[PDB]
């Protein structure tokens, strides 16, 4: 029965919690980082052209 | 039955969630980083030529 409770808790919390949190965080951070990288590339190109 | 629920949750969340999120994030970040590296190389070459 103790082992059963181990299984119950591990199934309930870890899988779904990690899925939701990791998916949302990774997607948002990846989109923001891609946009920031594009903006930095544009700014570096502008500075190089001015130079 | 508890073990069954463990299996169900682990299969449903982890595989598909990791697949989608990692694929999208890695592809976007890699493309942005490649573009930024190319732009930085161009800017460094311009600065070196000016020097």
UniProtKB/TrEMBL annotation, chains A, B:
Superkingdom of origin organism: Viruses
Protein name: N4 gp54-like protein
Organism field: Pseudomonas phage vB_PaeP_DEV
